[PDB]
């Protein structure tokens, strides 16, 4: 299931830590913690407040500048993001089960301690139709943190220092 | 929902028709028929035989060489494919509902003649867990067919001239 993960192709991407705002105004944050893991943190929008550690991901090189990250969520959400490092742009496709569209705050939590709850909401549905978000984002802040830094994403977005998510480079 | 579709950015990609083989040996074919539509045809693998016309897609430009096509299927399957034209490399992530994994032949048809049946199988489930296929592919054949050529993918894989899927360029 992870035969596609090729670490020699990902050396320019593993360790990236990016804060980005989709064109719909939703502000997100991702840490590429290693070849098959991300942590992430949502700052604003439909599921603002949500954060996730140790999300297993498929990370692949599409070009020297462009990397993709895809994954399955215990909520039933499926996601594929692409990051263009040279142009400081991200693109997301997110396929949300209809239950999340109807009551997105149900997913707003530190998900790692609510996995049965997410699977319960997911099992109850509705599943269909998916709410499909297909959106470009601007990468406002990007830095290299190296691999396996447990400190990058280790608190809820409400508990960060004033100005954290607004920092740019 | 199609805000991200920007035809002016896709002129180098719309019209492409590619045959590709994933790393697991499954041989696929896609025609980018216009800015928001693909036809596709599956030659081998778990759902060899299956073909689809007029699939609504989200097509975006990630770089001058890299494009992304993402979609939601009436079976509940969600997909995101990326194509690097310069490298003749494709990558796909496919999230199949569990019911397809259990009996994939149920989806092996000209789907457009079986839409109610696909919605019925999708609604009965099971949905979870997804079977997630994440794989590179070799683009073995690529050509430019222009937009809205209704002849590129219009018959089953078994109704093509001998050697069609084996052609190389």
Residue numbers in the entry:
A (entry chain D), B (entry chain A): 24 to 192
What does the paper say about this structure?
Enzymatic decarboxylation of biobased hydroxycinnamic acids gives access to phenolic styrenes for adhesive production. To date, several PADs have been biochemically analyzed and structurally characterized. PADs adopt the lipocalin fold, and the core of the protein is formed by two mutually perpendicular β-sheets. In solution, a homodimer is formed by two monomers that are related by an improper 2-fold axis. In this study, we used ancestral sequence reconstruction to generate thermostable decarboxylases.
To gain a better understanding based on their activity and stability, we determined the structures of N31, N55, and N134 via X-ray crystallography. The models for the remaining ancestors were predicted using AlphaFold 2.41 N31, N55, and N134 were crystallized with one, two, and three homodimers in the asymmetric unit at a resolution of 3.1, 1.6, and 2.5 Å, respectively. Also, the overall structures of the PADs were found to be conserved, leading to an RMSD below 1 Å if aligned to BsPAD. The C-terminal part (depicted in red) shows some structural and sequential diversity. N55 and N134 harbor an N-terminal loop (depicted in blue) absent in N31 and BsPAD that contributes to some extent to the dimerization (compare also Figure S4). All ancestors showed a highly conserved active site architecture with identical catalytic machinery. The residues corresponding to N132 and T41 in N55 originate from these helices. Both were found to form a hydrogen bond to the NH1 atom of the catalytically active arginine in all crystal structures.
